[PDB]
Design a protein around this ligand. Structure first.
Ligand code: NI
Ligand code: NI
Lengths: 100, 122, 570
């Protein structure tokens, strides 16, 4: 596979997001690391899908809403940043105040 | 009540900066064609040569703006700024090499500024 | 020109009178004073103050009052106060707490806090800065425990063990000269301060003392090695000669005596009473009464902290598991029931709140959690506020008195108990620069940056392959202070005076900073900062009820705690 250090680490975000998604599906209000993992993986998968950085900056604000998360979590997350390989190489996505 | 983890509950009031120091308002023009931004703590007389202002009025002073902020001059922009006095020992070293000692040596600072083309001497 | 306070606090961190919530607790700390000069705050970045000829002095060499490091705009939370200041570090030590910058042009700069060519900058605006936690109840069982400790703000591990050997799994002991030498050498690779305890057991002095001379920094008396009157006595005789501390886990079984027999063997000498409540070990059911005595420095371990609805079920089972007790053998059930008691665990909460239990510790990997000493301290203070109300001594709406009482339990008090507070345990000038930066939202939960000897050792930081350090995944990682030979200059091995005088460090080739254990035989409860109460604690032998000043000490267990499911992935 030729995994580099970043690829190995980023697998763990996908796994955390899968864990978090299962928790959300059984009715739990998500906590801080769960919410960050879901949004982060969505961005990385969006890059893989070929979306633009601008599309993901927009979409990342609509992945989770306040009713999906515990009290205070929206205010704990000022931004979520992720780097992924777009069709035009690695780019940084910053989602500001992802959960209102 | 709703808990925002780590939130502040600030006291009432306002914080006055550079209290007790003389304040001076001067007009400054960016005569250059590129933008110039000036930090709060740069000795004002030693800013970019293409800023035109009464250089003597920048001696021993700096912008009276919150620590770590800056004033911006777009190309050709002229505006007023408010200066405050430098404190401590009131000595400046380095920067544009116009002072290198006490800011009380106005004649020497201005002589150097004029010889090097810092606009607005006299 | 004036700045409103909201904007001021956003830019420079809070100032006098401002309050900050600790994580998601209901505890609020208030800035008591601020060493700045408003308008001359130090800050670093593009167009900011700490630039040559401005806030950074361009003239002075490093030796001429210039710092190696300036932490700007810190909100210090310490036994000494809750206040705003810049912190200046040099030669790995805290040399100035005050106002950093350039005396050329700024007012109020502390004379030895010049930012110069030699100075690195850490922005602490908006962070709470505490001393590194001092965990004095560490079983050295699994090296992976060090990162666990660093991640929750612990910077010193005092205890014993040789890895997952049964002696070590039960007791904080590195036994004898050879195991001690081996563990001193292992310690060269552990990125945290360490002090090693020998076996506080024997009936002749020489076997015990030779451990001290070999490089142990104290002793542990544990019932699993025979917490008999003789072992207690010999260990304290050694400690009084060597100037090292003795920890005790007493005879739970009351085999050779009851509590009063262990106190008679102590005979007024100073001793550190581990897990004083007694779930973690000690004369059943009344060991907690040790915490009332003047010569006892009392600490709790953390699984009982604070009392919650799952505490008893977890502990009864935990005890059964660890002691291989069958729910079948009446003696094993009776033993467990005599050891795990809601009555003493509930009172433990209250004794912490009253300043009668002076310290917290982990009991890492033996019956305690290596990364939860700080966490559970704050959960206990939060529970106490809710159940007992703000202490009578508070002022505004602030929890400052409680915050100083509780921060003391895992910083300065363990340091004073162990004879190492000249070096660590508080943010004071002249002490080693072991500092922990916390975002307020994560306070007491997960440290942002842990500074060891003036270099960052551990940080919550993101993708190493990214353009900037903040992108995911943000996780705890060892930093440059732990790499190469820098691990030697950023950490301290604490050792007895005799082993240092006998040249043990050179004999073993130890490269770490060597710290001297001293002044721990001439202290008592009165020396425990904000937790200096002596009183007659009565524990009813039939009901286990605890009384202090004729009042029963009781509180309810809570169903939920702050600093829990909002933060952790598991
Ligand atoms: Ni024990
Ligand atoms: Ni233990």
């Amino acid at each position: 596979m030729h995994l580099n250090p970043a690829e190995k680490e980023k697998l763990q975000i996908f796994l955390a997001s899968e864990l978090l998604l299962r928790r959300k599906a059984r009715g739990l209000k998500l906590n801080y690391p769960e919410a960050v993992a879901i949004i982060t993986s969505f961005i990385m998968e969006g890059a893989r899908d070929g979306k633009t950085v601008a599309m993901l900056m927009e979409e990342g604000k609509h992945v989770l809403t306040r009713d999906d998360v515990m009290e205070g979590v929206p205010e704990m997350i000022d931004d979520i940043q992720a780097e992924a390989t777009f069709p035009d190489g690695t780019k940084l996505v910053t989602v500001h105040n992802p959960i209102s | 009540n709703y808990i925002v983890p780590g939130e502040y509950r600030v006291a009432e009031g306002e914080i006055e900066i550079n209290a007790g120091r003389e304040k001076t308002t001067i007009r400054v023009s960016n005569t250059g064609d590129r933008p110039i931004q000036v930090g709060s703590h740069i000795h004002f007389v030693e800013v970019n040569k293409e800023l035109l202002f009464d250089r003597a009025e920048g001696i021993g002073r700096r912008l009276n703006i919150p620590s770590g902020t800056a004033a911006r001059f777009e190309p050709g922009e002229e505006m007023e700024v408010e200066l405050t006095e430098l404190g401590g020992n009131r000595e400046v070293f380095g920067i544009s090499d116009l002072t290198n000692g006490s800011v009380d040596n106005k004649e020497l600072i201005l002589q150097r500024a004029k010889e090097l083309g810092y606009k607005g001497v006299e | 020109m004036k700045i409103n306070r909201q904007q001021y606090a956003e830019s420079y961190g809070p100032t006098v009178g401002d309050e900050v919530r600790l994580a998601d607790t209901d505890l609020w700390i208030e800035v008591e004073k601020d060493y700045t000069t408003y308008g001359d705050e130090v800050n670093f970045g593009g167009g900011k103050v700490l630039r040559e000829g401005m806030g950074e002095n361009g003239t002075y060499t490093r030796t001429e009052n210039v710092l190696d490091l300036l932490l700007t705009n810190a909100l210090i939370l310490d036994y000494t106060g809750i206040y705003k200041a810049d912190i200046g570090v040099k030669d790995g030590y805290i040399v100035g707490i005050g106002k950093g910058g350039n005396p050329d042009i700024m007012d109020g700069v502390t004379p030895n806090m010049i930012v110069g060519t030699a100075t690195e900058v850490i922005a602490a605006e908006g962070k709470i800065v505490t001393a590194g936690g001092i965990d004095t109840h560490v079983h050295f069982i699994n090296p992976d425990q060090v990162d666990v400790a660093l991640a929750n703000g612990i910077t010193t591990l005092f205890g014993g063990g040789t890895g997952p050997a049964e002696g070590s799994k039960a007791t904080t002991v590195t036994p004898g000269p050879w195991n001690i030498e081996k563990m001193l050498k292992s310690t060269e690779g552990l990125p945290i301060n360490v002090g090693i305890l020998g076996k506080g057991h024997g009936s002749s002095i020489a076997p015990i003392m030779e451990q001290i001379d070999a490089g142990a920094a104290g002793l542990k008396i544990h019932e699993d090695w025979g917490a008999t009157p003789a072992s207690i006595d010999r260990s304290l005789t050694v400690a009084d000669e060597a100037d090292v501390q003795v920890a005790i886990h007493s005879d739970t079984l009351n085999e050779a005596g009851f509590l009063e027999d262990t106190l008679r063997a102590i005979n007024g000498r100073v001793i550190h009473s581990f897990h004083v409540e007694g779930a973690g070990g000690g004369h059943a059911p009344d060991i907690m009464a040790m915490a009332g005595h003047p010569n006892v420095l009392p600490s709790s371990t953390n699984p009982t902290r604070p009392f919650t609805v799952n505490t008893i079920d977890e502990h009864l089972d935990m005890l059964m598991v660890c002691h291989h007790l069958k729910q079948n053998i009446p003696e094993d059930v009776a033993f467990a029931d005599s050891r795990i008691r809601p009555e003493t665990i509930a009172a433990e909460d209250i004794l912490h709140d009253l300043g009668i239990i002076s310290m917290m510790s982990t009991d890492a990997l033996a019956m305690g959690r290596a990364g939860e000493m700080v966490l559970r301290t704050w959960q206990t203070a939060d529970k106490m506020k809710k159940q007992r109300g703000p202490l009578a001594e508070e002022k505004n709406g602030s929890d400052n008195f409680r915050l100083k009482r509780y921060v003391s339990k895992y910083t300065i008090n363990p340091a004073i108990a162990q004879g190492i507070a000249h070096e660590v345990g508080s943010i004071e000038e002249g002490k080693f620069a072991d500092l922990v930066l916390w975002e307020p939202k994560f306070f007491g939960v997960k440290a942002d940056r842990v500074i060891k000897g003036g270099i960052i050792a551990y940080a919550q930081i993101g993708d190493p392959s990214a353009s900037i350090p903040t992108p995911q995944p943000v996780m705890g990682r060892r930093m440059y202070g732990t790499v190469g030979d820098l691990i030697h200059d950023t950490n301290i091995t604490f050792m007895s005076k005799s082993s240092i005088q006998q040249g043990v460090p050179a004999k073993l080739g130890l490269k770490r900073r060597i710290g001297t254990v001293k002044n721990c035989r001439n202290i008592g409860k009165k020396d425990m900062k904000w937790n200096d109460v002596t009183t007659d604690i009565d524990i009813n032998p039939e009901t286990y009820e605890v009384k202090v000043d004729g009042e029963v000490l009781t509180c309810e267990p809570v169903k939920e705690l702050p600093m829990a499911q909002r933060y952790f992935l598991f």
